[PDB]
């Protein structure tokens, strides 16, 4: 048995951190966001 001094549970707080490597684009779920333009065969106002 080894009794060791630890940090009291009430003087620390677990905080969830979300780590990201880059900011997702506007049309993140779209494989081809350029197909709204390539399929505008009548024009756009």
């Amino acid at each position: 048995i080894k009794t060791a001094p630890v940090v009291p549970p009430t003087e620390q707080r677990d905080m969830v951190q979300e780590e990201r490597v880059g900011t997702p684009v506007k049309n993140a779920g779209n494989a081809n966001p350029a197909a709204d333009s390539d399929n505008a065969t009548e024009g756009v106002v």
Binding site: V25, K26, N27, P33, A34, S37, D38, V44
Partner: protein, 50 residues
């Protein structure tokens, strides 16, 4: 050559093709909306296939 091309005519007998004059001031292209949308997503185009 300018007189033979009627540079002497009355500027009131010269009618615009429309029978109206015009002074249009409409706010226009600056390009901040197009460049902002590029940085958000570079995979789109503003120019349509038409």
């Amino acid at each position: 050559s300018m007189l033979r091309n009627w540079s002497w005519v009355n500027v009131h007998n010269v009618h615009s093709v429309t029978g109206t004059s015009e002074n249009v001031v409409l706010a226009g292209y600056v390009g901040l909306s197009r460049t902002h949308d590029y940085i958000m997503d570079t995979r789109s185009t503003p120019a349509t296939s038409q």
